[model samples]
Target: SRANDAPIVLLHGFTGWGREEMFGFKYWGGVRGDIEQWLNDNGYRTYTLAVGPLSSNWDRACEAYAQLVGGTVDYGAAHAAKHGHARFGRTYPGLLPELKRGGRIHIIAHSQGGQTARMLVSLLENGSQEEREYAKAHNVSLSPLFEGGHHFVLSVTTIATPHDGTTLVNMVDFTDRFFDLQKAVLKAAAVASNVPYTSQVYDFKLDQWGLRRQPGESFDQYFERLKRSPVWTSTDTARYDLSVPGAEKLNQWVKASPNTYYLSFATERTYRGALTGNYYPELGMNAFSAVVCAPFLGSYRNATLGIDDRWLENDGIVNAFSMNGPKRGSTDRIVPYDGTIKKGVWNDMGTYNVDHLEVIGVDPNPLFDIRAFYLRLAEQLASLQPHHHHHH
Candidate 1:
């Protein structure tokens, strides 16, 4: 029975660490504790995946696939050549073997990690046409992830994810231009050292989705042209991918698997009220989050990005509405969470009144119990059987 129970994989969000010993702290559970360890102790098999903090969702998905099912990290020749990074990163020898024997896995991803997980699922279920064609042309073996590799994923749960993207990217851009003295100094240092400049903000705006190219422009030509700009770093890619337009473009490629259960948890750290005949929501952040998100929120409210009441409420970073599920014309939207689980469509677990950081057990808040929440979630997921019925 335990073998039949799908193992849970915890994926950290942007700039998050997995199990790696980084800065003497774990990324999933900041100062509060280790969530994976706690889940393991409670009789659930769990593993944390550390992906590129500043990489595009596609790149991160490839990295995840290599670790989860391919047994190696290969960013593919085309991708590496364009990005100017190593084709391979790290390796986990036993992960794929273990998953093959185990039969199924349940993934829980936070923030942009949610996007990463979705991309992984999509690639697994629907092999990328571009990658397949590229591999054939280059006489290279196609990576298992891009070759229809999805018979093991049982479910995916995204927590506080910007499925429809967030306006936080605008805020990040504003701060960089107006108040980021440290960033300026760092950029100067990196330039002087002949090293590539890197930042989460920069990585988030790079926009690597399938954007339209000029007439007769080859993929290689388009890629080269994009890279020629100073704003084509991994950080910039992440920023663009997290924007509303970027996420909408990304949704065109990702599709929900008919056999994999989908669930999402939304969080709200803001409330709406009437202000001078206009209804606007106010940020309900904690001491630290308030300080960090105040300027961004102010800037967002003033920007002309068509941000209405839906964009008003956020967990200090992601919009509450976006966290529920994808909302494109072809993608599925959130349904009621009545304790009934299904495959393919998103089942919203409802919104919580917690800040983004607090949801992951940051800053030590007594109002929310992060450990208990995950324990209950794991238990619920572990109870579901494999989906075999066909949907009309």
Candidate 2:
């Protein structure tokens, strides 16, 4: 039981949950083998904790995540009271200790789940001096190299994850605002649902990184565009605005944790590329805009989103510079004496080239060659903290 006890906990991302319905539900289901068997063979256990039926909004979703992990409910409870609905939370300190006693932990989070993990860790490290000290001893603190102990073997590998943010969303917002029909429909629905248009209208102009649509885009059209342009990329602009809730913290962790390894996997193969091209120029422009804004946005975030005016080339969702943390130019990028130097800021394990859904086996489910990746992850876990105990 003890050997089988200390397994890795797998968490899902935004609008992600565990169910057989379809879409995001089954996203991580296929990877169950690569995640569990490989880790299990390498002397580790694996478990998937279903978090959401996540609608939208990272903070809300995180509350849901915390609840799933049985973390502190103060935030979730308060949020529910204010909004009439509550999400999950990640009270790692409270929940984790009870789960496995005293031992290192390896957390593998996908998409927004990565954000949840980051937030959870940030809270733990920033909570109190004792918490900070414990994290440091455990190698989980977000300090400069020798940042923190690797008490929690955290390998944040995200596929098609919007590390920074996406510009296509901005494009989507812009396009939505220009559409008259969508505006009329959302307006009518708002009135019927008794929800304020401003409240119901996923506002793109908000100062937050959450999904907000342009003024007029219909949900159907939005979904359709997403379906067609399922490939996710980061916006250089988003990279600049790190002052938000989670961005600053993630940057800090990257700087502090010498033991924490951040790996991001993206797709490049576009739909138009394989075909005769020319599917939609506007779509291309949106993607281009996202790429263009990624670096600038990343810089802004690192600088606290105070608007210093900077940018970078990104994969429509995350800027290359931001995704590649080392390239950000901050001294925080310096390598620690005890740490091994990595080649790039954003470690390019490889490219999938397909749309976002492909990473998690979308409609057609692109099973991007993940065997090597899993092997590497297993190796990384072993190097970090070898779980010598076994089930056999």
Model 1 score (lDDT): 0.67
List residue ranges in candidate 1 displaced over 4 A.
1-4, 81-86, 172-236, 276-288, 298-306, 388-392
1-392 in candidate 2: lDDT tens per residue?
23223346665554343332222224353432334555567666665555432223234334433443354433333333334332222343333543333354556665455555544444433332443455456554221211222244344444554444333333334333223322332332232222233333332211222343335655554434433321112221222222133344444443324344455555432222235221212133233322333223333323454322222233333333233232232333423223432421234454444433334432122344554555565455445433233344
In the range 265-353, model 1's lDDT, one tens digit per residue, is 99876655455222223343545446555335433553465566556677777777688888843466568788677667899989988
What C-alpha lDDT values do all the predictions have? Answer: 0.67, 0.38
**What TM-score quantifies how close candidate 1 is to the native fold?**
0.79
lDDT of 2 at 284: 30
Against the true structure, candidate 2 reaches a TM-score of 0.50
How many clashes does each candidate structure show, in the order listed? 17, 55
